[model samples]
Target: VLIFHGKPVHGAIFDMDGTMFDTERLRFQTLQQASQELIGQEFSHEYLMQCLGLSATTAEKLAQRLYGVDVPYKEIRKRADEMELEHIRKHGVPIKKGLVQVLERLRKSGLRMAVATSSRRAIAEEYLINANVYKFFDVITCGDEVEQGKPHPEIFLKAASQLHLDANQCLMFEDSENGLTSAHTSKGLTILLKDIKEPNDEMLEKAHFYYDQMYDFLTDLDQFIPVMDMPEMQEPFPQSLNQLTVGIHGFGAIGGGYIAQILSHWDGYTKPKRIIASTRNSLFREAVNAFGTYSIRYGQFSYDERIENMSIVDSDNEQQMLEMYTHSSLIALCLPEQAIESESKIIAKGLYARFNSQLETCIEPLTFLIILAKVGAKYLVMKHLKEALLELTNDEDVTEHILKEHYFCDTVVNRMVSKLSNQNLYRQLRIKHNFLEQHLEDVEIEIEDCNKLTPDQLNQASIYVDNMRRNFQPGHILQSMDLILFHSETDMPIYVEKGSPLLEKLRQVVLVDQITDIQLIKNRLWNGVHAMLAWYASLMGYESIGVAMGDHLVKAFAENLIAEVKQGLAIVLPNYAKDLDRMSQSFLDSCEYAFKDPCQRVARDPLRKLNHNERVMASIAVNIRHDLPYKNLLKGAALGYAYAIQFLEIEETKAVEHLQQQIQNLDLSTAQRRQLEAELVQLIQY
Candidate 1:
């Protein structure tokens, strides 16, 4: 039994004669008789075999060459055709063994079937009818209908076109070299049958599969069809991959990364029905649409894979974009944290349209996954969506129904994607790093061994740092550390309808219930300390985070800060205490490996990091409330505030001055205020 690994079969194409009917021997007999009658000589088996898979006009030309041009080619062909039809009428055209059974199985399975042959329309139709298989084919492309015949791909191309499927979507069955060549050239999945004559080595190499009889194919049909054990839902889920679609907003790094994962991981059954993406960049949209695919260069262990089935749409096209979201079973927002508020309105508009349209019919819940890395981004997106829904419909019940019916979740994107600084690298690799180009400033840096650096000498080296961007190339391997984190509920699932087919296929996604704790540990502890290190590293003329982490001062500070946060959080939420040591070790190990990580990238958004409820301030707030020693957290916040001042414009000076004044009136004792002001002023001066 053959097992097809590619996409499920949507259509099937069969060659006539040796494939669908056992008529090659009978036709050879008729040809020999006609040749002898016309030329008074015996027809050679080798010569007759040459005419087996040729069109009528081409076969006549061959016969004319075999006999002198003086021999009447038309008369010989007519006699042979007449005798063949006469014989078939008397004894009926012989069909191939198990032809009916295979045809019936494909028909029952609802797969479209077609016939592509090098025979004339009249002869082909008559033979099929006589063989009792004429009713099976939905499309029949004859040699007369096509400008070119077998071995040229015209007949098979026409058949696939008539069936309304891509060439790759069709599975073809053939017996002759010419027929197999045509199907192979059309890029269809080809199955060669050994009947009458064995195919040559060249032809056999082109065939994806081979069989001796039609029964052999029928015996393995079940293996080719994909089956899944799906969970029950209020609305029945799509039984086949073709029945679902996925929509993505922001086709940048995160969006494109997910697309790459889908292409690399998903099998025939788990693959989505379709993928629609929205992007604001017209050049990127045009490029992706024109190319019809993109490649993802994972790290060093996994080979690069090209992803397909993604259609790019203009994000500004509200009508089409909304329509896409309305029909999508799952929608992923991979936009920046700041854009979530505005994009949520767009999602709400689509959901509102769907809710109103399906008011009469049964409503099926949709799933939305947020791929932003910021803390509370999920709640922020959900809040904006709720507000937008109510504002659009102005009805509480309608908005509530839409909200309750859809699943909204957040993801902690932990993958380290370093930006491609060298445009020459992108050009050399023939890749488009649109996400990096859109979000990050152009900068270049030299990569060196982090373990070889010393504390005092690290800052003296020339290492450039700017923004976060990742470069990828073909055949790059991926590692286990490169993955995203998600919150999965075993008892109360979020996506009630489809149960997240994407999550099922992607090995890089880790789902856990301790999502809040994970975010706190990552964003507050790791991200906050990383920002603090970046600030100090910059002051010391170091650019790379890995190089700075190698410094004894930076390394010691991070270790102490992590321990303090873990101890504080253990008291606040003891559930995550056991995992703290492992998580901290993992963070340190990643620092050693991610030598491309830049301090400038980590320290860019200082103003956002300084929010009262954000990483730096939040950790400090927790420490103060719990009356725990928070000198390290305080120092990190002070350094972050100092670093943010350089980015303020002339018009934004008042905002900075207002913060300084707020520090003066912090309701702290004189000694406390003076000590805090001393550190702040000293850092600002530097």
Candidate 2:
């Protein structure tokens, strides 16, 4: 929803034949009837083209000729007219579905209405008046009033002129190609409510709004009608993709800012054009659009940098996403493992559009970097894209075309991102900035990112450090990690499983082969234990991961948890057991010191983590599969169950009963299942 409403307009113009009434098809049926009954011949679909846009008069226009220049021509037209009017008097105008609601909404919003139709004089009046919608229109322009038919802007201009508004000030509702072209050329805002006529790319591109059906309009009314735009709080939309355009389908709130910032500075790659972030979050959209830009905080230092050239698209709006996907050459999938199915369904729609564009434009290939998920992130994403394409088109040829044109790569990012309150940083910076300008002079007065500081204060710093000494160099901040301090540390590395040659040109990225064990380690070893032990961190009432690390229990458990993961790795992944030697306690402590991972943030989504096969239970499942010792992991799972119990406010007895049930359901002997259930339940008591 727009925080501030969009365009201001006072009048709306509608086309009658298809936009307001579904009578064009009716006219077609009657004309076909007239030809079939009189000439005893079927009117083919191509033959109906001759009668295009000839409404009402079709009964008056099409008549059979005999040797006498007529053979019961009166009877043929009279029968057609009776059928057309008979359906009308019986069905009550068959006004396009959901139209009265739209008219009522416009009327209440204080906008006047007008009609510009090719349906001439009495029929237009009869259609509107009998439909009871004549009261809605204040001005009416029939076909007889126009010198040229639509596709010429004269009718729209005349309608707007008679409504006492500029052509651009009116909102035009259209259903035909000619009507839309006329409105669009007139420069009024145009909306296309698709009807019997199919729309081409030109009609689809020119119209400001489009809906599959009139019923769909109700869902997006708030976004279209007057309540549309925000102030210049964002950069203008990119005119073209001359530079690299990167799109992140999800995770914009957590990883989006850093991804864009990294792409902006990623050396040797094409310059970033913009970021098309897809999110369903409305308030964030309102805030981001209003700012016109967003800032990323550098927790290590005292600076923040603005993220530019960003556009947000709503996930619920399928058409908008299709357009975005068509424009992006590089895409990042940051959504969760479960979201792959639904998101891929939406993605396939775009790929279909891309495949169909081969004749209209050159088919462009895109790469989807699957950021983080289970081991086969790329496989899962690619499989479903094919599945959805098959579901969408049911054509193997189309699926093959779409698959050949895109690339999907598997990647596992080990970076930890945590969210904190901006209000704390907002006030902290006010003091930090004031103190810097208050007491420093005649020395290295290093004020980072002075572009973000007040201009008056920046000029004051010029008296101390000469502006010509390269002292005003600008920098960008991409991480904060729960710090309100002065020191800076950035060691964010990129780890991607090598696939395309595209990765060879990037800097600071470690590309390796399909090391499946490494992916498992990132999952069961890193993420599994990261959450398993952290369950009690929030339960222990600690603020951050570093704060929890200082505690004796959490500190000791973090060590043992790694040992347990190593033990499980020895069974299922024996080759990588040697690597676990370096995943020591010191490594854990240093990471906690560097990125103060939040308890609630890292421990987010308790139920999914606690139950997902590739998550907290993964190490245990591997140990169970190989009939190895699963002792320490039982405690880890216990801690997770305890976390879920507290977080969801459920009973320990009932939760553990089901918890033990799942443990028992796993593949293992009766003795081991009973032992595991007993030990796990015992740990919960502690």
Candidate 3:
């Protein structure tokens, strides 16, 4: 028996044929071929769908209804069945994707698995055995064994009865309207999978969950199962964070900083029981283990603080990492942008395993939160997680439920965290963090208030710290070296999530329904101008962004580019007009922050930045679509392309030449061609 939230999950019932094996399409084909040979015409698509997912007797009746009573139903059935069985026997059954993965997970959870199908007992068992999934099921209830067929719920009711499970105590998977009707009537949690047939609105509404593929279901299964062996707090600290566990996937700058904030500020009851951090770096792992703590030095405030009691594990150790993830109530993904895809697979696998393990005993549904701190690619990370889960579980319906039960919040990390420059301080600090600024204004915590708290309260209260800083180096300690200046247009760090419980706790992370406006402003307006200035800097032999911003010509060009992009942005996202104006100046001011930010760094990956949906080209596309004048923006693109070719060695000559010819070939007015030709000439020259 499988236990979920303290109650027994008697069994997980699944429909055969379309739901389990990829036989429905083959069945349709065989019937079509049989009808053509016997009746001199193929059966219509509509007529065949009526016969699908029905018992042999009911299908025969359907054949009479569609083809008239005069039709040779018995002969057609015999011929179709013979062809299908012969094909299956020769080649074996085609299993649906994620079938084995889901079944294995369910079986491991000690859930009584069963198969209820409209096909006869012999045929059903044959298919199941051939498919190598028959062993997973505790019982198989077939159509011929039941007096009433599906749409009547008899077969499902019988399967649940055989497993000694009440209808409400089981979970059912179906791909057909009839099967869904039966499962729904059985009063189980019905999930509909998309197969050869599409379920109509009625069937969709009847299902508790609906997914297009089995893998999607498996990908989302983690959200439904409880965490295994999650600790409970004692009476005095009944609300103690001992019940909560937070897992950090990567123990790097962002990870370490967040941990420091949590340790120093969060209320005792809200602080998690333990913080598990996974890192591939042996140095970091050893340091965290040896010291049992890490430090964050806010250079702006000349303050240093230590975060203690963190459990560090080797990310390479899959078993340990999986255990950490399975037991944690919240997971923070602090890996680099490129690592999101690879690490997502590890997380999905651990979550799936944990969910299955929890299903064996836990009674409450598992609800967790995922925090994405990677600067960009929030949706990309989410997609990676979904794809990873699908690959691991191979069941789409369960994956959907898994996603629904968990909340994924994407955050913009605006904090500037760098390593300590002083070697002596680095060794003395264990892991010292340098923050240029504080957290976004909305989330910023005053250090004085934190310091004023009692030692116990300081450890317990949810602490907020400034993520925004101007410099990470002490003024006198650093001599004449330029200190970094961190600046922002807004105090709010943009957070995008549908809704999450953590939103209430992490007050610094602003929740937004949509991030499109914020993304446009950041990517096109801010990054676009930054790239423009960097390219100009590269061409003019300037090493730093500040130096480039000091150039009057480059500064004017940057301002113009920002203006043109802002016009387009205003048109596309008029709601953010006020924010656009404020952020525009903030971005320009950031370049003057004496950080010595490199032109080469910003101008690197020119081809990617020039993508149709990226900074330069994206802004250009928007303006072109809106019929706005964008000569300055086009000039910026030309300069960017030239910089790529000159310094980055991007081979674009042939492409530019091809575009020159194509522009002339287009059916445009002479004036338009001349204007376009002029832009291409400048682009090619650069």
Candidate 4:
């Protein structure tokens, strides 16, 4: 009997002939006829079992071993075959006990099923077709396909492989011990229809899930099948976007472009979303409308219609943007970097007023923005955003707001906005689609490719401050930036850059009840990978480090090197390992990030700077030394050192000379210095 745990088995293998249908009487008649025709004698059941799985010739040879005489096996088998056919034609093949019931149960459960048999394809097909059981299986494998018959694993393996199921998940039903041995050898569960009195060790050892009859399987499916343990199916969440109001403070290129982008990809943003644009003048509003309403057109895939009847809530004062900001979860400021202090004061005062006054309900995630216009604008923007959030969230009486009630994040935005005169290109784009005409004319191409821009300044600050807040206690509101700098320069970048997936996966990791909002700040796209690529390129000696990594040999070397690093890093930086897997996939899908972009990949600092075992650099170096596959990384390491020296020549010459003198003065043998020099040269050459 077959035992079930929950559902029927994932797959089933059924043996045909006497096992399924009671045709043993006809088989014996044919065997007796064949023995008489071939050797003028009757055969015994004992002799049949002895030669059961062998060819007639082999069976005849075995007979000689037992009976001490040669028999014409072929002539006997011909007569036997004819008698068996006659017997089957006269009385239809009788279905075996519980065969149909088990087949039905497995079918109802949606299990993949197959049939295997010792008979040739034509014969097996004829019986299954006549018996109307051919539809039961997803696949059928027959004896003719294999060079050897029963006890060989080929047939069962073929069936399971064809079905795309692991052998361990399959079950086979057979009558004779020989047939059972074949299934067992294939690493499938084997059930014997009748207890073959002879129990062989091979068959006994390989059988996993077994039963005597089909009825036994049906009765206990829950105990045997993997599907029985499948959890109750869950309904999927609503995939529609979470609609919310967005407020933009500046009407410059970045702000105008962002508005255009949002209107263009409105469907991607959320359901019933509204954009409240607060700019300084009527002309700016026109630019905002032209860009936001019809500046850029997304093709059919984007599925957003043109923005209609946009409510132009005009406000002359910067404080007017606050009217919308109070209701907004996200606020973007695109003011000039030089004007951050004055502009931020107004923003902060408004934010403070909003937070102080109890609104109708609780609001969260008051996101601030950084325009990142100038080289170091990210730092200034972060400072202002932090002050604004502090003013809004801080209660001087209690030192600071509770960590859980609010979250402030610093982010970097990267995108190249071609001058607005590129409107001709937008015109060309609009002609292709009628629905896109309204929005395509004036759309602002904000920083579409965030990977290209130097947005890390803000991201670094966010991680730094978040980590600080988590470690902060009462009376810690007035802490110095020096104390925070150590944690920011070391701990935060390590966690943020390693881009660990575990940290990203959980909503939040609570340690000691302090909440730290984790934002993956390190760009893992072309920039992140480029940091590694530059080192590799330097080692390979191309005109530019980008060119070296772009070469097939060096690129392949880098991939292998990273894979090795991942294997080792998984042991130490488990969080970063998970992040790498997730971020790698995301960057591939969205960024089309290429290593060949020299400006994107070539290090501003030398390769050595990217690798040094000091402060921020130490995190990457430790990960490489411990987990990076050393052999592959040797080239990249050499390249990094080369870049480091080059960077020193261009930027920090004094420090590089000081470091060089220190190396020269080391209390080591000449051989050690030569090794270091050779290492340095090898790194720089690429």
Best candidate (score: lDDT) = 3
How far off is residue 636 in model 1, in Å? 4.1
Quantify all predictions' global Cα lDDT against the true fold.
0.66, 0.67, 0.68, 0.50
lDDT tens readout by residue for model 3, 644-681 = 77887867775465445554554556776567657756
* Model 4 Cα lDDT, one tens digit per residue, 569-601: 456546556555644443332222232245323
**TM-scores, all models, native as reference:** 0.46, 0.45, 0.48, 0.39
Best by TM-score: 3
Model 3 lDDT, full chain set: 0.68
Which sections of candidate 1 miss by over 4 Å? 1-243, 258-269, 300-305, 356-363, 390-396, 418-514, 543-601, 604-686
Per-residue lDDT tens digits of candidate 1, residues 442-516?
A: 332444547688844554453323122233322122221111211111111111112443354233344564467
Model 4 lowest lDDT segment of ten: 482-491
lDDT of 2: 0.67
Off by over 4 Å in 4: 1-244, 248-272, 277-320, 332-343, 353-382, 385-406, 410-528, 534-550, 585-602, 607-620, 623-628, 631-634, 637-648, 651-678
> Tell me, what's the RMSD of every candidate?
21.1, 22.2, 22.3, 28.7
Task: Itemize residue pairs with steric clashes in candidate 2.
Answer: 6-228, 6-229, 233-291, 233-292, 234-292, 299-480
Query: TM-score of model 1 relative to the true fold?
Result: 0.46
Model 2 lDDT tens row, 1-686: 11112767788899998888878778668866876788676445654554454553462344331113444546655777788998998677877756765676566567778999977888899999878888889999888889997989888899999988898778888988888999999998898988765677988999998987675664465345442121121223222122346677873534454455444443321235567878887655554564455665544443555666777778888887876677776677888878889888898997787666553222447767787656667778888888999989989987887787677777756444444345654575566445445434323345555687687888777666755444432111213212221122232444566765445434435566874756767777777777876786777887677788878888787877787677778777676554556444424744456435666666776656766365566677677777666666777787777877778676777776667667665667788667766777788887
